[PDB]
Amino acid sequence: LSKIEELQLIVNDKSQNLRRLQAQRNE
Amino acid sequence: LYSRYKKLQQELEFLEVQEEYIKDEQKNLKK
Amino acid sequence: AASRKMAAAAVLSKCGEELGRLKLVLLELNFLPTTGTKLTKQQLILARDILEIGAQWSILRKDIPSFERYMAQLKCYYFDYKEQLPESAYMHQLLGLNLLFLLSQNRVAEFHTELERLPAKDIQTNVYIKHPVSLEQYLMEGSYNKVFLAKGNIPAESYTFFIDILLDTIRDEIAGCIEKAYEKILFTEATRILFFNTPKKMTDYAKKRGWVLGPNNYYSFASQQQKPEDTTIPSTELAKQVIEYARQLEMIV
Amino acid sequence: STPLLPEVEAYLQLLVVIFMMNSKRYKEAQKISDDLMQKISTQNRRALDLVAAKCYYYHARVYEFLDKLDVVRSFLHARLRTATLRHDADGQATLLNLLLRNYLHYSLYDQAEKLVSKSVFPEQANNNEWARYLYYTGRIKAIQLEYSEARRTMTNALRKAPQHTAVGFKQTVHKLLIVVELLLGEIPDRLQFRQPSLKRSLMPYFLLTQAVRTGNLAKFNQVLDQFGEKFQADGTYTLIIRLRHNVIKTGVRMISLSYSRISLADIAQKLQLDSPEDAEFIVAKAIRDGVIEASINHEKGYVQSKEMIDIYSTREPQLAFHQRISFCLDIHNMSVKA
Amino acid sequence: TSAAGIISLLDEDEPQLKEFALHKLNAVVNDFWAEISESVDKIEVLYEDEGFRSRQFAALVASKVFYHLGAFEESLNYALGAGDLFNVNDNSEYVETIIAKCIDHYTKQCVENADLPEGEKKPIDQRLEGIVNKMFQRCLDDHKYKQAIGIALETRRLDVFEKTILESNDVPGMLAYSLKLCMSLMQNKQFRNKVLRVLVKIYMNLEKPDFINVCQCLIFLDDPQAVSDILEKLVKEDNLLMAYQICFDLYESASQQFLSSVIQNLRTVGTPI
């Protein structure tokens, strides 16, 4: 059961980095 | 539930491609 | 069944055999791990007696590897982590004998873990516990004289086995001091210091170390620095400075 | 999220109320807690936004005094499993702190070694969110006798947490902090000490610290007899024994003069006060050790030693510069981070 | 309590003693694990030995402790040796985690296996394959098609896939799904084409999957022979409608060369009827 959930966590985490890192680029 | 799994995978790959590019962009801009 | 018959035989060759037969009987009983620090009366009590006898006879046979298995087994009868209520006269003696064994092995930590385990001031106060605790204090200090004693409850039982181990450690520590302190000394002074009676064993140790002797003992030492490498001899620094400067500018190393 | 939060909060309010309004003792409210604890059990992975420590927490504090409610271990052990490790991490980390405490107070610090090993496994939290973790962690290391390590962790604990419940928490940490100075054998200034903790409480630690700074045994014994109680209260007893060694060790160090010969006799007169007549033996240990170093003749009744005027002429400042630059540099990188 | 007394009994040599101790140990694992984790290595020495007959039981216990430590992969390895003390449908978290991870192990191998003859690789674990056979059966009892095809694609084994396809009216819905998936998930040709090829064999057995679907696979694979043969039976049967459906498809989609081979075969046979 656990596999789809674990997969789901990692995407959540990566996006917050990318938003941040992106935000430095526009500036 | 385990049918879901491929669908999620698609999202992940997309991001890693985008992510790296941003680093590169930073370097270029400096110069 | 066996236990009473065992006590009578000991007042020793034959006992050591009987242990193996005793063991068989413990296997039928299902409360070998079960403890609680309460008296469930001939469940826990019966198991307790059987273990104590075997332990006390492990000491008299002088068989140390078996001693540890019995001690580990016996230990949970006494406290769970804490709480005491089914006590023994023997419970003191064994705890003390283990504290001493723990000393000879050279484990300071095992001495402390125990203090965390069994807290209060009843621990320090009783005479039986006191022989190890006094000896532990003396060991730290490097007070060789304080250590040498033959009286107590504990010197009666199995401390005899320990005394040799304890001496060797002190004598190694005294030889290393004497080379640093003294570059020359008289032979006789050295014979007293080692606190061995006969000159001869004290001669044996000296040849073993490999010293030249005479009516005097000879020793020589002296060191050098700021010429053999240091972080302040520059070659080694250059490698060290590369990392410092690299951190500083970004690298990062 | 919006419906979830009132239901839990009602439960939470239910618990506040039962203490000395539906109890009169701290073992009667408990009956009521236990049936309510079911709720936590019921939803597994249907939540992660929760707090679920409180019920078990109220039960649990009471076991720390010296009472028998050791049942609770079993309960915390199950919970660490319910959270996968890969799922519901921040809540698991809080639980681990409460289990670690329970263990610390009573016996075997060894089971903590393992807890630490667990602690560093993939988490979505940080173990520095509640400083209390550091405090427990410090005692462990203290026993093992890394005075430095315990110092770091405790001091980090003091940062970014007291300015409210500074009352109780600063006092516990502060008492251990002082002890660690004594254990390390390097004891700082008397001015500093006053302002930490409650002033009344500060006083027994201060008497002890002063005695150790003088480096005289007899005073150390007299004060210690009075203050059996503190060590007992705290649940760290082992310290009482350990400190004894330290006085003697400071005392030889204290007495460092200068000259290519100091008479042995001279050292022995000062030393007479510390110990009856076990003097030379102690000294020998000390020299051998390398904390100080010397040559002794009992034959000519003199101790000969090395002279130093060559400080700042060898690497000891080199290590210092390197260590000092580093502290400034981390914060300089950090300011930029923002 | 201390785990130590009990743990010691195993270090002693007397096989009855061990077996007695072992029965105590399997129960007490969850409470004690932290203390037990130091001692794991000796427990393993006993498992390795064939001069001790309770080898399967020991494996099961060791593995539980590694789960509690957090090394799943290692726990599995001992677990395959336990063999028959592995059980499915007990409705635990322990069981769920490991069956899941098994699909992953098979995946780990398939890549490697693709570059070598395809089916199975020279190093395989029979024991590992067996857990997977059991998983299928598990899932068949529920009678879910959407789940069924997901696993089959994903574990990258053709043989599973074949078995799964049952019934008639649900199957056009299911095949449409599989087709989009294989394209959209795989940008790996070797595998991706293989599944379409397996699917062709499936198609002929029905009266249709879809007349259009039969044409589309030909256009992807580019096999001029295959079109020819399918077409030719249609002439004989006198299916005008079936025949006309073929020809508008191929004209629009395909290239001049593809078309030429197909007309050559048609023109010899006659006008389609």
How many Å apart are CA E90 and CA D218, to the nearest integer? 69
Q: Which long-range contacts (CB under 8 A, 24 or more apart) does E204-212 make?
A: E206/E168, E206/E171, E209/E171, E209/E172, E209/E175, E210/E172, E210/E175, E211/E242, E211/E245, E211/E246, E212/E245, E212/E249
Across the interface, of E147, E184, E185, the residue whose CB is closest to B3 is: E147
Beta carbons of C76 and E24 less than 8 Å apart: no
User: Which residue bears the tokens 């694992």?
Assistant: E29
Q: How many residues does chain A have?
A: 27
Crossing angle between the packed helical segments E93-114 and A2-26, to the nearest 10 degrees: 70
CA distance E160 to E147: 13
Q: What residues of chain D lie within 8 A of the CB of E30, using their CB?
A: 77, 81
CA distance D166 to D161: 8
**Cβ E192 vs Cβ E186: under 8 Å:** yes
Number of helical (H) and strand (E) elements in chain B, helices listed first: 1, 0
Inter-chain residue contact E147 with B10, CB threshold 8 Å? no
Handedness of CA C24, C25, C28, C29 (dihedral sign): negative
What's the token pair of residue C171? 């004598």
Nearest-by-Cβ selection for E70 from D74, D85, D111: D85
Residue in chain A lying closest to B6 (CA):
A4
Of D248, D315, D325, the CB nearest to C230: D315
Chain E residue whose CA is closest to A2: E97
Q: Which two tokens stand for residue D250?
A: 């400071």
Angular region, C222: left φ>0, alpha ψ -120 to 50, beta rest: left
β-pair partners for C217: C185, C213
The verdict on A23 touching B (C-beta cutoff 8 Å) is no
Q: Among all residues of chain A, which has the CA nearest to that of E92? A: A1
Could you tell me if A24 lies within 8 Å of chain B, comparing CB atoms? yes
CA angle C21, C27, C28 (to 5 degrees): 105
What region does D197 belong to: left with phi over 0, alpha with psi -120 to 50, or beta? left
Q: Is the dihedral of CA E194, E197, E202, E207 positive or negative?
A: positive
**What are the structure tokens assigned to C76, written together?**
């949970």
**Spatial separation of the C-alpha atoms in residues D184 and D150, rounded to whole Å:** 10
Taking contacts as CB-CB distances below 8 angstroms, the residues of chain B near E153 are: 6
Q: Which two tokens stand for residue C217?
A: 């003992």
Q: DSSP labels for C160-196?
A: HHHHHHHHHHHHHHHHHHHHHH-SEEEHHHHHHHTT-
Partners of E147 on chain B (C-beta within 8 Å) are 2-3
Give CA separation, D190 vs C196, D166, D179, D204, E15, in Å: 48, 21, 14, 13, 65
Q: Is E185 on the interface with A (CB under 8 A)?
A: no
D neighbour chains, 3+ CB pairs within 8 Å: A, C, E
Residues C143, D296: C-beta atoms closer than 8 Å: no
Number of alpha helices (DSSP H) and beta strands (DSSP E) in chain C = 14, 2
Question: Residue type at C80?
Answer: D
Cα of C98 to nearest chain E Cα, Å: 15
B10 touches chain E (CB under 8 A): yes
Q: Which residues of D55-91 are buried (b: 16+ CB within 10 A; e: fewer)?
A: bbbbbbeebeeeeebeebbeebbebbebbbebbbbeb
Do C and A touch (≥3 CB pairs < 8 Å)?
A: no
Q: Are E102 and E96 in contact (CB under 8 A)?
A: no
CB-nearest partner of C231 from D244, D288, D315 = D315
Q: Do D143 and C116 touch (CB under 8 A)?
A: yes
The C-alpha atoms of residue E75 and residue C118 are separated, in whole angstroms, by: 37
E2 contact residues in C (CB cutoff 8 A): 72, 75-76
| Mutation for testing the C interface, residue in D69, D221, D241, D316 having most C CBs under 10 Å | D241
Contact between E163 and E133 (Cβ < 8 Å): no
How many residues in chain C? Answer: 253
* Amino acid at site E271: T
| Dist. CA C168–CA C173, nearest whole Å | 9
Quick check: bond before C252 cis, omega within 30? yes
- Residues 6 or more apart whose Cβ sits within 8 Å of residue E209: E171, E172, E175, E202, E203
B21 lies within 8 A of chain E by CB? no
